[PDB]
Amino acid sequence: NLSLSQSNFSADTYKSFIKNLRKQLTIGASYGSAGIPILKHSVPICERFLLVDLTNGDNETITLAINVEDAGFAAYRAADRSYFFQNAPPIASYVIFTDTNQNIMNFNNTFESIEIVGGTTRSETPLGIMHFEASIFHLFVHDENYVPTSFLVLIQMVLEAAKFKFIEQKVIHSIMDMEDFTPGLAMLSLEENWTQLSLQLQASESLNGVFGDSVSLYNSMDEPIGVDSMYYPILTANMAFQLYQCP
Amino acid sequence: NEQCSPQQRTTRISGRDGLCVDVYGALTADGSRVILYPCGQQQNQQWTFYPDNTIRSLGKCLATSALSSGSNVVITNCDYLRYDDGWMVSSSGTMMNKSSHLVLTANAATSRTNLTGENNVFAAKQAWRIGNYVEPIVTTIIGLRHMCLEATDNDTNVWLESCVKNKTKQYWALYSDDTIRVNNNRNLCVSSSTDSSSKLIVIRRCDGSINQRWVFTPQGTISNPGYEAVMDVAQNDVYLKKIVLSSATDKGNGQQWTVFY
Ligand SMILES: *[C@@H]1O[C@H](CO)[C@@H](O[C@@H]2O[C@H](CO)[C@@H](O[C@@H]3O[C@H](CO)[C@@H](O)[C@H](O)[C@@H]3O[C@@H]3OC[C@@H](O)[C@H](O)[C@H]3O)[C@H](O)[C@H]2NC(C)=O)[C@H](O[C@@H]2O[C@@H](C)[C@@H](O)[C@@H](O)[C@@H]2O)[C@H]1NC(C)=O
Ligand SMILES: *[C@@H]1O[C@H](CO)[C@@H](O[C@@H]2O[C@H](CO)[C@@H](O)[C@H](O)[C@H]2NC(C)=O)[C@H](O)[C@H]1NC(C)=O
Ligand SMILES: *[C@@H]1O[C@H](CO)[C@@H](O)[C@H](O)[C@H]1NC(C)=O
Numbered sequence: 001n002l003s004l005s006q007s008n009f010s011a012d013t014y015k016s017f018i019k020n021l022r023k024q025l026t027i028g029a030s031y032g033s034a035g036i037p038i039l040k041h042s043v044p045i046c047e048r049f050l051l052v053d054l055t056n057g058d059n060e061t062i063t064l065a066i067n068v069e070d071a072g073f074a075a076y077r078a079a080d081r082s083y084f085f086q087n088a089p090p091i092a093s094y095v096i097f098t099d100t101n102q103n104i105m106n107f108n109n110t111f112e113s114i115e116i117v118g119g120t121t122r123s124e125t126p127l128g129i130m131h132f133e134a135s136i137f138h139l140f141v142h143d144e145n146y147v148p149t150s151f152l153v154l155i156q157m158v159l160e161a162a163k164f165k166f167i168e169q170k171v172i173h174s175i176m177d178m179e180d181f182t183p184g185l186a187m188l189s190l191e192e193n194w195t196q197l198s199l200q201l202q203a204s205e206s207l208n209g210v211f212g213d214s215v216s217l218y219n220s221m222d223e224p225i226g227v228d229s230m231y232y233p234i235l236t237a238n239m240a241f242q243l244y245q246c247p
Numbered sequence: 248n249e250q251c252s253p254q255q256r257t258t259r260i261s262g263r264d265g266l267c268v269d270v271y272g273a274l275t276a277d278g279s280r281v282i283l284y285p286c287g288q289q290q291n292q293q294w295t296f297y298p299d300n301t302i303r304s305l306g307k308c309l310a311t312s313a314l315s316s317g318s319n320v321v322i323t324n325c326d327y328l329r330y331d332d333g334w335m336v337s338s339s340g341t342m343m344n345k346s347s348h349l350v351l352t353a354n355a356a357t358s359r360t361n362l363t364g365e366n367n368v369f370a371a372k373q374a375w376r377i378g379n380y381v382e383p384i385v386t387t388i389i390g391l392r393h394m395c396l397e398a399t400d401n402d403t404n405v406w407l408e409s410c411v412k413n414k415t416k417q418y419w420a421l422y423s424d425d426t427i428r429v430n431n432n433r434n435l436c437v438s439s440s441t442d443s444s445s446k447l448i449v450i451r452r453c454d455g456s457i458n459q460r461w462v463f464t465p466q467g468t469i470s471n472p473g474y475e476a477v478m479d480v481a482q483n484d485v486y487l488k489k490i491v492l493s494s495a496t497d498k499g500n501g502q503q504w505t506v507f508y
Contacts, residue, residue, distance in 0.1 A: 011393050033338050035465040165467075169507045172393055173410070186508070203251050208336040210296045210377055212253025219385070219508045226380045228258055231340050233421055234384060237463035237506045246251035 001063060003053035004158075006133040011175045021162045022240050024050055025071055029241065033209060034201050034230050041069055041244035045091045049074060054154065056136035064154070065096045070243055071159050072109050073151070078140045085109040107148070111155075111191065118148025122188060125152045127171065128180030132157050156183065156191070164190045165238050185218035190238070193217065197227070197235060198242035204230055205246075257295045259286060260302075260342075261381035261423035263353040263372050263455060267292045268362065270322055275305050277323040278312060283353050283360040286381040294377075300333030300345070301325060309334065311344045311364035320351055320362045339462045339472055340374045340425060341367060351375060356455060369473030371436075372455035376423035383420035385430055386508040388469075391480045391501050396490070398429045402450050405437060406488040407480065421506075425460045426453055437461065439471055439492045446491040448478060467503045468495065477502050 002024060004017040029037035050068050055061040063077040067089070074088040075096060082097035087108040107117040115121050125131075135153040138146035161168040167187055174181055183191075193215050200211035214228035217235070227235050260268035262283070269284035273291035286292065295303045302309040307322040332345040342351040349364035353372045367373060387410065388396040394407035395417040402416075410417065418430035419437075427437040429450060436453035440446055453459060457473035464470050469478040471492060480501035481489035496502065 207296050210256045229378045231376045233463040
């Protein structure tokens with residue numbers, strides 16, 4: 001299992017981890033004109049999950065199951081316990097973490113769901129090395145008070161960073177500067193639009209790289225940039241892989 | 248999923264010095280010329296793309312006007328192109344007539360320059376950004392050892408330094424002509440070597456050349472497509488204060504870059 005430990009969490013090791021996570025997610029990816037790998041689709045449930053190990057500051061380790069189709073967390077394991085999101089594929093519990101005490105979390109693996117259940121938003125949830133660390137702990141013991149914010153942290157710092165080099169770089173800045181951060185409009189607009197950028201990029205094949213709709217991406221100055229084509233470096237050099245959307 | 252097959256999109260097209268592709272005086276007669284002009288909202292800069300590979304303003308079609316290079320690009324009645332395969336835009340922003348291989352070019356930088364069909368050499372003056380957002384994109388550029396490209400020696404050189412948020416010379420303006428410009432001095436462009444004896448990437452006055460056309464690829468390189476090479480940290484050693492143009496290699500991380508905007 002690909003793994004990342006708080007014990008060895010330098011900008012380099014973080015970067016290698018994200019690079020390898022992308023590599024593994026994109027095995028058997030298709031490609032369009034844009035050159036951005038499109039994740040696999042219609043994957044047999046037995047092959048649908050990539051397992052990733054995260055370890056906090058004191059050798060407590062969780063294993064997260066990532067759905068290779070959408071780069072989302074379906075479930076995770078801590079010791080001989082496991083926890084499945086309500087919208088995980090219904091057959092997943094027969095395939096992953098079969099020899100554990102399995103449990104169902106009563107919320108979906110989406111930001112909307114996790115934010116409502118936890119009563120707190122990404123904009124007010126700090127990110128950084130110590131938050132990563134503590135998030136792993138709270139998941140390890142499954143302290144229900146902290147499980148939703150723990151997922152906001154880890155989804156963003158692992159999965160969303162894998163999706164977008166911009167976000168990977170926000171975390172690197174955070175490691176180098178020894179400064180936690182909250183995601184601003186730039187980061188959130190990427191997260192919000194991953195699905196829609198996926199669709200537009202694929203749809204653009206029949207319009208010389210031009211999108212059917214514009215997508216607003218904010219820069220670090222909170223200025224909105226309309227991306228209505230593939231000819232924006234802030235998309236094309238940023239989004240590392242896409243959701244399958246079009247034939 | 249019909250979202251997969253959009254029937255049209257209306258956008259703008261910007262290019263050299265961030266000027267827009269403009270039907271001169273909004274004239275609609277066949278052969279009315281296309282020029283370079285400051286970008287605005289006017290209909291004669293609104294370009295509509297369609298699945299038949301036409302690009303249209305004022306109800307008519309963008310088109311070359313000769314088989315040989317050197318002649319104006321014009322708009323003309325779209326029925327005159329019913330049996331033509333049309334335009335092809337490369338992933339790097341080169342707009343090409345499919346039959347003739349001529350490419351939309353701006354031979355000068357000034358407002359009202361006539362756009363022409365030219366042989367492709369991958370010059371910056373042959374690079375365009377199809378999109379409604381025509382502004383230069385302000386960014387830092389992160390490379391090896393998580394360092395930032397900085398304009399140095401009175402905006403004549405460029406190399407990696409530790410990223411400092413406030414530091415004005417670590418900001419770059421990314422233009423619609425695929426140039427990378429000093430943010431505080433937008434007449435200055437990152438340039439591959441004009442001296443045959445050197446591979447050293449430098450900063451020079453923007454001139455529309457191949458040397459100044461750059462592509463941020465999805466694989467994380469900064470490619471100069473006409474010279475078939477990429478930006479590279481010399482010897483993968485940031486302390487040498489040298490960025491160079493090299494052929495793509497998987498050997499070092501010196502060819503990996505990030506746009507942080
Ligand atoms: C950008 O494009 C336009 C359109 O192509 C340029 O304009 C044109 O320039 C021609 C000469 O380049 C004009 O021709 C003159 O036309 C009269 C009758 O129209 C004719 O009696 C003249 O001898 C002359 O014609 C040519 O003579 C030389 C021959 O080789 C050639 O076959 C003849 O056609 C023509 O009217 C004109 N077209 C239009 C619609 O304007 C334009 O050039 C700038 O304006 C023109 C008027 C002239 O001052 C040019 O020298 C000057 O470059 C060109 N550049 C810009 C920036 O607009
Ligand atoms: C692309 O270029 C080709 C060739 O220069 C153009 O095709 C010519 O169109 C003219 C004007 O209708 C015809 O008279 C010629 O017979 C065509 N030549 C050939 C070789 O087919 C075409 O118009 C251009 N298309 C666009 C959109 O610019
Ligand atoms: C969870 O997501 C599913 C989609 O599979 C949706 O139908 C359901 O209403 C969502 N419920 C919550 C808790 O938001």
